[PDB]
């Protein structure tokens, strides 16, 4: 089997991407944030505290003839950005882009933190990291990909995120029309439960490439590119008037600037992030200070190749017995 779904930016900045997911019988379609940096599929629901729901579509398990309470199971998650959610668990039929899993754990939120409530466009998360990170207790549950894997034509999914445009998530096949040149594959460590890999270095604009190992994770659920402070300083030094602002919480730059590109290495290959991809717009409405898309990972404890980097590539998440990542230009 295969599946193929379109993923759409939630706003004009590509702050996140949502993908429609069918849950239950008859189908209830919710728009979920596909997150290769976590392993829970959780949804706003009929059980979510009413004051914490503001415009999201909810899953109502009592309206699904295939929903079953997973008795005794609870979940609770805290993300890198300080947001959180928790609740109880159902199993139900979940379909993505025509690919169906029966008996998927659907984690129903009883509580969500304010950042979830305030984002009316995201109805929940679909985690695509390794199932060792899943938070369901006392019986840990499998991701949608891990449940689908054995049925797929190939044990892979691909992320093809758009810049200010829709893109695609495919399951079980590699669309050879969706990228240019060849896919370069690179080793993955699953020791922290992430799609963790080592970039071979970077360049800023038309500058020389610096060969240096940068360990980090491929994370579709993180908006920005978080790298070591040395690398980030080297990038922003090429932008007149850019500075790190403790009050704003990262590097800002004059909205009048033209940003340089950023290149990262994948083995002997190179992925080029155009400068425009690194502009996240005014820090507040009407400001002439703009927020940068490349930020320091200092204090986060890991480097994160989030959407700013991934949207410059066609990315293969290879779930074979020994997982690997693939990157192609597009």
UniProtKB/Swiss-Prot annotation:
Class of this enzyme: hydrolase
EC numbers: 3.4.23.22
Keyword presence, Disulfide bond: yes
Catalytic activity: Hydrolysis of proteins with specificity similar to that of pepsin A, prefers hydrophobic residues at P1 and P1', but does not cleave 14-Ala-|-Leu-15 in the B chain of insulin or Z-Glu-Tyr. Clots milk
Molecular function, one GO term: aspartic-type endopeptidase activity
Keyword list, A-Z: Aspartyl protease, Disulfide bond, Hydrolase, Protease, Signal, Zymogen
Peptidase A1 domain sequence ranges: 17-328
Active-site residues (renumbered): 35, 199
Domain of life: Eukaryota
GO biological process: proteolysis
Paired cysteines (S-S): 255-290
Protein family (similarity comment): Belongs to the peptidase A1 family.
Protein name (record): Endothiapepsin
Organism: Cryphonectria parasitica (Chestnut blight fungus)
Record lineage: Eukaryota, Fungi, Dikarya, Ascomycota, Pezizomycotina
């Amino acid at each position: 089997s295969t599946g193929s779904a379109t993923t759409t930016p939630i706003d004009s900045l590509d702050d996140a991407y949502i993908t429609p997911v069918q849950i239950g019988t008859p189908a209830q379609t919710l728009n979920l944030d596909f997150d290769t940096g976590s392993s829970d599929l959780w949804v706003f629901s009929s059980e979510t505290t009413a004051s914490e729901v503001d415009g999201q579509t909810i899953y109502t398990p009592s309206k699904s003839t295939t929903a079953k309470l997973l008795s005794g199971a609870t979940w609770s998650i805290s993300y890198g950005d300080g947001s959180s959610s928790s609740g109880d668990v159902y199993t139900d039929t979940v379909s993505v882009g025509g690919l169906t899993v029966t008996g998927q754990a659907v984690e129903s939120a009883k509580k969500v933190s304010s950042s979830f409530t305030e984002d009316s466009t995201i109805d929940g998360l679909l985690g695509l990291a390794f199932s060792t990170l899943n938070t369901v207790s006392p019986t840990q549950q499998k991701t949608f990909f891990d449940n689908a894997k054995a049925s797929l034509d190939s044990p892979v999914f691909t992320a093809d995120l758009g810049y200010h445009a829709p893109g695609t998530y495919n399951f079980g096949f590699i669309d050879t029309t969706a990228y240019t040149g060849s896919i370069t594959y690179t080793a993955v460590s699953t020791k922290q439960g992430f799609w963790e890999w080592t970039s071979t270095g970077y360049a800023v604009g038309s500058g020389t490439f610096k060969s240096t190992s940068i360990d980090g994770i491929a994370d579709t659920g993180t908006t920005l590119l978080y790298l070591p402070a040395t690398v980030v300083s080297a990038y922003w030094a090429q932008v007149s008037g850019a500075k790190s602002s403790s009050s704003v919480g990262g590097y800002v730059f004059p909205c009048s600037a033209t940003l340089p590109s950023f290149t990262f290495g994948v083995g002997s290959a190179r992925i080029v992030i155009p400068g425009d991809y690194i502009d996240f717009g005014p820090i507040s409405t009407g400001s002439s200070s703009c927020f940068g898309g490349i930020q320091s990972s200092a204090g986060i404890g890991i480097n994160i190749f989030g959407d700013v980097a991934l949207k410059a590539a066609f990315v293969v998440f290879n779930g074979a017995t020994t997982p690997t990542l693939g990157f192609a230009s597009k």
